[model samples]
Target chain A: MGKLSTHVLDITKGKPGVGVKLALYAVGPVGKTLLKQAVTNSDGRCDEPLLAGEALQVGKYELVFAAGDYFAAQGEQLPEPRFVDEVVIAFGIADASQNYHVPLVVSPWAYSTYRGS
Target chain B: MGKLSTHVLDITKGKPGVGVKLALYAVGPVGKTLLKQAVTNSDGRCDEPLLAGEALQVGKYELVFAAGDYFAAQGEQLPEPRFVDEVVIAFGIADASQNYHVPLVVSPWAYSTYRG
Candidate 1:
């Protein structure tokens, strides 16, 4: 079955983005229209995909990670020029009925994300 | 002596993300709060930094890129499970009084970003 799922790992801690919030939006002309939001669990996974079941749509989308705060909450002071402010990737979902797996691996100043299986 | 700037390069084309849209946001508990928006010009950059000088703030933020549409507009079709769909990065702006140079290098299936 097709669905949307995600994994948030704290590269800095080499763990998951536990308790971190993730938001989903449909990119548009005016701005990103929010679709759904979730928080990472102990395994750095949300109780449900940011988008799944009947909420998946076929178009541009965005995810917001509260990384800095996550780090700060853990007592990490960022450098002068934080390597990343936000990671914005513009991708498409050609079909709405296919599974979309996205995972984010991040550190204090660097991060990587891709379609995971 | 501080400012904010950005560069957008389309790794798919090995050039800048010329004419791509970039939006800035201050992430929060309820949702991502939008702060600013700009589009990549010929050199894959905006006329101004997404945030700079007085606009810089201390907290977590996000950027949204219209990559898929940009490629689709250029007659490119994305695969199922596109590796990236609006890359979401959360970073900190500690001092709000320093130069912040962030850049995005992207392709059809992969991308990288740092405080360059």
Candidate 2:
């Protein structure tokens, strides 16, 4: 059994994105199905694995981040309908037995995510 | 005039993603319209401005990078239907008069893009 984890970084502040909310969704031919929801801790990681052991499965998925809200809460001055609001990253899980460490680096105007080791 | 530029880096190799193919699209309620296509140079940047002067507009846009093909050419062994193939980054341009530098950092299994 493998596991999935995520980290959120506020690159603009050069600190962890504490309390930023994220949601996972499994994609299908029909539509997206919500899988799990979690908020980043002080360390910018979820307290527990998002998916582990038998709960992990191979498929297409998407991660939605409440970037605009996070930035707003942090007091960043952004225009209405900021450059990035609800950031979404669509990806695939080819092998469930392998560890997936996806991390998101974000700022008020931009964001990035990668499958980190 | 404001401008738009991009850079691509191969994090797996810690090098510039030279020669990678990328396409820019302007998104609208109707659909997406291809704006421009270019290849990364030795410095991982397009030789020309992706959008500059009056060509730049205020609206939603997307960048589609050929990550899977780039990795294959680099000799990375990625599984079929790799974790990432066509990496797409969607964003909004609230202020068209300001510069927008979006860059993509990618590997065989992962990728990241940010408004640099």
Candidate 3:
């Protein structure tokens, strides 16, 4: 079954971004519409697939990671307008039968994301 | 002396993202304004600082990487709407006396970046 998953890692601390909030949005002619919201578990992954089976479609999507809030909770001192506050990753799914794993490795000042699996 | 720099690595290939093109921009009330453009060298870095000395300021900035074109040139078959075409990293510099080293570790389907 086709599905979508995500993981968040704090590269600075070399650990998963536990408890961080993430929102998934589908982009279409009507503009970005929220599809779902999940927080990173202990492993920096949601307990369930963001999308699966017939629910998954081929189109554009975006993932918003609240890195600033996560870092603040971790006791990191960030700048006034933090370098990396809200991390946004925009990607596309060209196939509906494949798995889409998008993972984010971030810190208070920097972040990076890419397609995985 | 503050400076801004970047490096590109092909994590999947375990080598530098050589020959990749990148553009730098400054974000302000007027929105993103292009500042400079550079290509990754053999070592996956630009020959000079993207911003330095008096040119470096405390504000928001963005880096756009031409990952799609880079991978295509490397002979990697990608999807019709490539998973990752252009990689954009937007960050802020709050201190003018620090060195900001932003490096991107990327592959055809995956990528990661951080402050070094």
Specify the highest-DockQ model's number.
3
What digit string (tens of lDDT, one per residue) describes model 2 on residues B1-116?
78999999998879999989999998888888999999999999999999998989888788888888898888887776577777877777888788999898787766666677
Model 2 chain A: worst 10 consecutive residues (lDDT sum):
A79-88
Q: Where does the lowest 10-residue lDDT sum fall in candidate 1 chain B?
A: B80-89
Q: After aligning candidate 1 to the native by TM-score, how far in Å is the CA of B87 from where it should be?
A: 6.0
Clashing pairs in 2: none
| Model 2 lDDT on a 0 to 1 scale | 0.84
Docking class of 2: acceptable
Cα TM-score of candidate 3: 0.82
Residue-wise lDDT of candidate 3 within A58-100, one digit each (tens)?
9888888888889989998877557897687878889999999
Error of 3 at B84 (Å): 2.5
Position B30, candidate 2: lDDT:
86
* Candidate 2 ranges beyond 4 A from true positions: A27-34, A41-43, A109-112, B12-15, B28-33, B109-112
Candidate 3 Cα outliers beyond 4 Å, as residue runs: A11-16, A26-37, A41-43, A53-55, A109-114, B28-30
What's the lDDT of the predicted structure labeled candidate 3?
0.86
lDDT per residue (tens digit) for residues A40-111 in model 2? 899999999988998888887878888888888888878754778767777778899899888888887667
**Lowest lDDT block of 10, candidate 2 chain B:** B107-116
- Looking at candidate 1 chain A, the ten consecutive residues that score lowest on lDDT are A80-89
Q: Model 3, B42-67: lDDT tens per residue? A: 99999999999989888888888998
The fraction of reference A/B contacts recovered in model 1 reads 0.60
